[PDB]
């Protein structure tokens, strides 16, 4: 990620969590990446514990997020000559969603006591509404390309861990070592403890 800081035109870690330089000293695994585009003032809505327009109908961020989000401006790739109406956003649901899941459903939301058999009538509308994306729009309406990076730690053996190449080995010296994300100081002696493969 040292070169990926500037291989793509995005703001370098405008989020909360582990320090960007300190990410080399982690043994996280099983990352999750989601791809979506937001509109203008929705940057503030994507935060752990935030309750915004996105955080009330589209994507819920739990308090124990153990990560952050990455967003940047996209006024050229996401904005063609014609209006870009290829992405929509939910506004109508009976209740809030559950964190870290998605529920896509093309269903008419009913407001009144009477039910609707998929008919947009008196008190029955659709939650999905088209984005207003145009290259001539202002900063409050420009499409922003957003990807979320999760750095949670699992008790399972980390198949990803951290990118810290390889180095030599030493024995019988009280030295500080960081193994599987845990720091400890001591010698490296030989013991006859039986180890099962797991």
């Amino acid at each position, epitope marked *: 990620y040292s070169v990926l800081y500037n291989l793509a035109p995005f703001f370098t870690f405008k989020c909360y969590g582990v320090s960007p330089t300190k990410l080399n000293d982690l043994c996280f695994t099983n990352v999750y990446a989601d791809s979506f585009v937001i509109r203008g003032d929705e940057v503030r809505q994507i935060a752990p514990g935030q309750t915004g327009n996105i955080a009330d109908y589209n994507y819920k961020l739990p308090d124990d997020f153990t990560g952050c989000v990455i967003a940047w401006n996209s006024n050229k790739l996401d904005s063609k000559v014609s209006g870009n109406y290829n992405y929509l956003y939910r506004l109508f649901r009976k209740s809030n969603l559950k964190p870290f899941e998605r529920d896509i459903s093309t269903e008419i939301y009913q407001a009144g006591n009477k039910p609707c058999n998929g*008919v*947009a009538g008196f008190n029955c509308y*659709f939650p*999905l509404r088209s984005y207003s994306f145009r290259p001539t729009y202002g900063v409050g309406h420009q499409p922003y390309r957003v990807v979320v990076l999760s750095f949670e730690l699992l008790h399972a053996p980390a198949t990803v861990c951290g990118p810290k190449k390889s180095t030599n080995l030493v024995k019988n010296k009280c030295v500080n070592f960081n193994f599987n994300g845990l720091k400890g100081t001591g010698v490296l002696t030989e013991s006859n403890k039986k180890f099962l493969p797991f």
Partner: antibody
Amino acid sequence: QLVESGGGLVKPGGSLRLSCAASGFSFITYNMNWVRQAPGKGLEWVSSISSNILSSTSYIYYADSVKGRFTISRDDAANSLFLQMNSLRVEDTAQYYCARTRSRSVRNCTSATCPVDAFDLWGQGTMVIVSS
Amino acid sequence: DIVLTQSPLSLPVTPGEPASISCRSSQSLLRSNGYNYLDWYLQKPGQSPHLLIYLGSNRASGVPDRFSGSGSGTDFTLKISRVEAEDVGVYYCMQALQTPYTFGQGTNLEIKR
């Protein structure tokens, strides 16, 4: 749907290309239908199709004629739509309306029966001539 | 398919008094949750048709208050209170029970001037 492209002389053994040239509009997520019309009085629906946003299945709705000869091809990525066919036997004057259904969702619809509310997005530009 | 009739096609409409149109459907619309499966389409000659009344007896699409659909049971009717020069267009009725939609014959609507 705003304008349509069509016209030209085609042999009965040839193939046409019925397309609607859209503009800034939510045509990608709106299901539509094709309705033809006789040169005299009286319309006739010919074809319909939905999008992948509604469901994994395409919610296929074919009559006898389109099952016999026609086929559909939805890009499901932009505001484009094309109609394909192989031959031509009795096709003199067809309006071929490009209207869309007044039902964003598809509910209580089988593979052969599906209620529809109304249409309001008819267009002009799909003329066919074979006698030229 | 469903056959339809258009016996009010020869309707000499005049401004000042109401006029009515009707059509016949072979199947019954009673199997519904209070939503009548009727609609009226006004086909303006030359450019594009226009939508008057959608499914059910409600007003939508910015139509004037004169247009008002009606019908309860084995009947089909449309209530028009005022007729003007902008009412040049034929009418159609449709039932959405089956996917092979087949519209009936057209009307004339000669304004008795």
